Amino acid sequence: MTRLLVLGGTTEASRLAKTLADQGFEAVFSYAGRTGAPVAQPLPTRIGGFGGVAGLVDYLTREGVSHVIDATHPFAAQMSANAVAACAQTGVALCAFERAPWTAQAGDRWTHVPDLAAAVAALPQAPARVFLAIGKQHLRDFSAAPQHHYLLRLVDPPEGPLPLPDARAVIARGPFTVQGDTELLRSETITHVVAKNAGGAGAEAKLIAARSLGLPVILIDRPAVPARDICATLEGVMGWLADHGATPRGV
Numbered sequence: 001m002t003r004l005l006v007l008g009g010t011t012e013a014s015r016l017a018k019t020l021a022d023q024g025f026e027a028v029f030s031y032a033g034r035t036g037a038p039v040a041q042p043l044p045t046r047i048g049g050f051g052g053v054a055g056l057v058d059y060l061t062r063e064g065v066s067h068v069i070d071a072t073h074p075f076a077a078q079m080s081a082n083a084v085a086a087c088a089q090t091g092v093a094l095c096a097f098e099r100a101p102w103t104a105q106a107g108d109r110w111t112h113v114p115d116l117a118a119a120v121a122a123l124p125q126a127p128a129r130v131f132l133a134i135g136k137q138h139l140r141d142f143s144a145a146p147q148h149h150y151l152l153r154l155v156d157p158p159e160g161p162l163p164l165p166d167a168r169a170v171i172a173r174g175p176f177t178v179q180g181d182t183e184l185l186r187s188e189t190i191t192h193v194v195a196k197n198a199g200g201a202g203a204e205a206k207l208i209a210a211r212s213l214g215l216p217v218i219l220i221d222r223p224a225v226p227a228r229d230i231c232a233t234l235e236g237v238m239g240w241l242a243d244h245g246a247t248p249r250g251v
């Protein structure tokens, strides 16, 4: 019998959790605990790491998980690799719920770089006004280009000093809206946006906002992850679960 684990942290994961609850599945939602107080989900929620591959193996076994939906961020590549390894070791079925990368349309002015360090190298020499729309974990990389003014967007207020000599943070969590990000990029007079190619619904706003302002985006390509089934849409996840024998409680 069916007991799902949703590895979360995305808008996709939240939409899936709502669906799973509404359809009466037995399921647990998992956060890493990267933020101080993550928003509530409509499933019993675990918070914290598993202890690597071995730890996740152990959890899947003791919890009696039948299926894992990896709905983590596309750039949370360690978690995603760990899930491929732990599910292969235990024989638990796994699908990653991740949408196609975002692709450029009319009016976008995008350049692509392979990783965060290359995004730092992409910035111009002369001081600019750069929206580092990349969260918290890798802000320090931009200490290699300290001359810019940086706009940061952080879930929690910083405790430590920031590694950037000219920076302001907004304290906010998404989902973000086009209206909201337009006003931010205007008010801060941003010249350049740095973004990871998440592909998700929750942080596409900054790209549309940039397009409305005529601004360039330096877009970081997704990191390598080992092969596993990919469920690209919510409907895809629900078909995959049905196909692999997951059923709800029957309420």
Ligand SMILES: C/C1=C2/N[C@@](C)([C@@H]3N[C@@H](CC4=N[C@@](C)(CC5=NC1[C@@](C)(CC(=O)O)C5CCC(=O)O)C(CC(=O)O)=C4CCC(=O)O)[C@](C)(/C=C/C(=O)O)[C@H]3CC(=O)O)[C@@](C)(CC(=O)O)[C@@H]2CCC(=O)O
Pocket (backbone or CB within 6 Å): 008, 009, 010, 011, 012, 014, 030, 031, 032, 033, 034, 035, 036, 037, 038, 039, 073, 133, 134, 135, 136, 137, 138, 153, 154, 155, 156, 173, 174, 175, 176, 195, 196, 198, 200, 201, 202, 203, 206
């Ligand atoms: C957009 C977005 C982003 N999150 C960042 C900020 C990444 N999100 C977190 C952790 C995190 N975000 C929360 C709100 C979840 C969401 N963040 C979203 C969603 C809105 C969408 C998503 O990501 O699909 C969403 C889901 C909200 C939902 O619909 O419910 C959350 C839970 C909660 O606190 O309420 C947790 C703890 C998760 C956990 O413990 O498992 C990281 C890891 C830490 C941020 C911090 O501590 O300030 C950071 C990436 C990083 O720093 O490298 C960024 C930049 C990813 C990126 O590069 O795209 C990007 C914002 C880019 C910008 O500013 O445009």
Ligand SMILES: NC(=O)c1ccc[n+]([C@@H]2O[C@H](COP(=O)([O-])OP(=O)(O)OC[C@H]3O[C@@H](n4cnc5c(N)ncnc54)[C@H](OP(=O)(O)O)[C@@H]3O)[C@@H](O)[C@H]2O)c1
Pocket (backbone or CB within 6 Å): 007, 008, 009, 010, 030, 031, 032, 033, 034, 048, 049, 050, 051, 052, 053, 055, 056, 071, 072, 073, 074, 075, 076, 077, 078, 079, 080, 082, 135, 196
């Ligand atoms: N760019 C982004 O990561 C972005 C945006 C919104 C959310 N996030 C979310 O923020 C979280 C942290 O991402 P990250 O960049 O730190 O990932 P990561 O580098 O891939 O993960 C590092 C370690 O954190 C633990 N972890 C990650 N996601 C977890 C989850 N959902 N449940 C339980 N443990 C988890 C695992 O620890 P153990 O090996 O100890 O198990 C993992 O090995 C994830 O839930 C992710 O979806 C990331």
